[PDB]
């Protein structure tokens, strides 16, 4: 019987939680902590990136193989359909809700 | 300073409260509490909302006298403008971060 | 067979629209336009609104109805236990999903 | 000059986009796309995921090495302080907004 506020602070630290209410079923949301890569990396091997956003990348690093972009931490689902949101945001009703629980 | 489920507990007491890099911009949020409100004002006097919205109040409570629409609470941001946003939304940075304060 | 940007075009015309993929039934989006109104109404007559908040409006504004607080426009949901959310999110999910329907 | 729905749609077309206020901030977002990955990568080799959600993973699809997850497609802000966030909100004003430009 948890608040948003304590639901948050169980994501901290690493648990998954989820609300009674929610219309889906079996469903759960986490955190994804903070991660540093070197911009050589972004440029050249990770994906899931889009083109541009690797040019805009190498145009402001270039060569370099210690300059680094930081990703902050940030929220995900684990939806109904089995898929994985990053980046799961919070309703009025989920913020303001005191039906919380841990799924682990 | 405070976490974003503290400043919910914060804004469920009925106080204002912003991040404190808002400060210059002179922005904060407050909740609205629940309300529920007559049909009636909702079918002919409340102003704010569309047509198709009054109509389906209508199509499923014609001439009622004692049918009530119930509006949740939700989060509100007083602007940099000075406008009113309804709805404010929190982001993954908001949400994670640990420097909310009470503005009143 | 909608994108976002359509329902949002749809939403911006004064229509109700949803989600054939959401997992709730029978629930609906819309949007509530721009409404300003005189101060005096928002310190003195609008239950929907926190103590601290009217008194921020009393010690900011004036008293005589030409003095006024601008609410922008936003979005709404109907939800499917048939309260309304003031402030709908748009999900990752829903911003890029091409499932979205005219319900009015 | 752009709504939200066609830079959602320019956002599906691998372009970065923006608020035209942003630009003295030079923040923007971009769109990363679905990607499908075997579990046992995800539970021996990604890197930022909680050890709650490894263990999930491993207790629903033991070492098959054909079980996939699918990651959807999602919204990221290179941010003002140069940081990346994963999973960008779009705010009330944000999806109503007729400002969008594109950035590249």
Same mark, same amino acid.
């Given at each position: 019987?948890?608040?948003?506020?304590?639901?948050?602070?169980?994501?901290?630290?690493?648990?998954?939680?989820? !609300?009674?209410?929610?219309?889906?079923?079996? @469903?759960? $949301?986490? @955190? !994804?902590?903070?991660?540093?890569?070197?911009?050589?990396? $972004?440029?050249?091997?990770?994906?899931?990136?889009?083109?541009?956003?690797?040019?805009?990348?190498?145009?402001?690093?270039?060569?370099?193989?210690?300059? !680094? $972009?930081?990703?902050?931490?940030?929220?995900? @689902?684990?939806?109904?359909?089995?898929? $994985?949101?990053?980046?799961?945001?919070?309703?009025?009703?989920? @913020?303001?809700?005191?039906?919380?629980?841990?799924?682990?």
């Amino acid at each position: 019987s948890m608040t948003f506020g304590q639901a948050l602070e169980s994501l901290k630290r690493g648990h998954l939680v989820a !609300r009674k209410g929610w219309n889906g079923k079996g @469903m759960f $949301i986490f @955190m !994804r902590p903070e991660d540093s890569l070197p911009t050589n990396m $972004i440029v050249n091997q990770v994906k899931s990136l889009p083109e541009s956003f690797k040019r805009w990348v190498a145009n402001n690093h270039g060569d370099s193989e210690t300059d !680094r $972009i930081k990703f902050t931490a940030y929220l995900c @689902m684990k939806a109904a359909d089995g898929t $994985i949101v990053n980046g799961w945001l919070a309703s009025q009703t989920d @913020m303001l809700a005191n039906d919380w629980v841990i799924v682990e």
